[PDB]
């Protein structure tokens, strides 16, 4: 089952990415530093009813860099910003 319930524990430091829609839509995504952004694929697929065919992108603001994962933990990307911004257009 797509993660979907990816929630940030209230006892450990984890990264949380939020996504807003240019049409007045908003979604919250919480990820763990030891997880792989690949998990987002199942999560998105779970709530991918409208995104079905929407051009979107995910990027962080602090360092101002384009997302970049791999497959292992999330911090391994060296970009663990904790709070990232995702745009939907």
Curated annotation (Swiss-Prot):
Domain of life, per lineage: Eukaryota
Subunit notes for this chain? Answer: Part of a ternary complex containing STX5A, NSFL1C and VCP. NSFL1C forms a homotrimer that binds to one end of a VCP homohexamer. The complex binds to membranes enriched in phosphatidylethanolamine-containing lipids and promotes Golgi membrane fusion. Interaction with VCIP135 leads to dissociation of the complex via ATP hydrolysis by VCP. Binds ubiquitin and mono-ubiquitinated proteins via its N-terminal UBA-like domain when bound to VCP.
The UniProt record lists the UBX domain at 10-87
Provide the taxonomic classification: Eukaryota, Metazoa, Chordata, Craniata, Vertebrata
Q: What is the annotated tissue distribution of the protein whose record heads this document?
A: Highly expressed in heart, brain, spleen, lung, liver, muscle, kidney and testis.
Compartments where located: Nucleus; Golgi apparatus, Golgi stack; Chromosome; Cytoplasm, Cytoskeleton, Microtubule organizing center, Centrosome
* Full-length numbering of the shown residues: 282 to 370 of 370
Effect upon mutating residue 62 to S: Reduced interaction with VCP
Q: How is the protein modified post-translationally, according to the record?
A: Phosphorylated during mitosis. Phosphorylation inhibits interaction with Golgi membranes and is required for the fragmentation of the Golgi stacks during mitosis.
Q: Which family does it belong to?
A: Belongs to the NSFL1C family.
Protein name listed in UniProt:
NSFL1 cofactor p47
User: What is the role of this chain?
Assistant: Reduces the ATPase activity of VCP. Necessary for the fragmentation of Golgi stacks during mitosis and for VCP-mediated reassembly of Golgi stacks after mitosis. May play a role in VCP-mediated formation of transitional endoplasmic reticulum (tER). Inhibits the activity of CTSL (in vitro). Together with UBXN2B/p37, regulates the centrosomal levels of kinase AURKA/Aurora A during mitotic progression by promoting AURKA removal from centrosomes in prophase. Also, regulates spindle orientation during mitosis.
Outcome when changing residue 20 to A: Reduced interaction with VCP
Organism expressing this protein natively: Rattus norvegicus
């Amino acid at each position: 089952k797509a993660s979907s319930s990816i929630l940030i524990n209230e006892a450990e430091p984890t990264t949380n990415i939020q996504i807003r829609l240019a049409d007045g839509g908003r979604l919250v995504q919480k990820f763990n530093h030891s997880h792989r952004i690949s998990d987002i694929r199942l999560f998105i697929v779970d709530a991918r009813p409208a995104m079905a065919a929407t051009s979107f992108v995910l990027m962080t603001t602090f360092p101002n860099k384009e997302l970049a994962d791999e497959n292992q933990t999330l911090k391994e990307a060296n970009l663990l910003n904790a709070v990232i911004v995702q745009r939907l257009t």
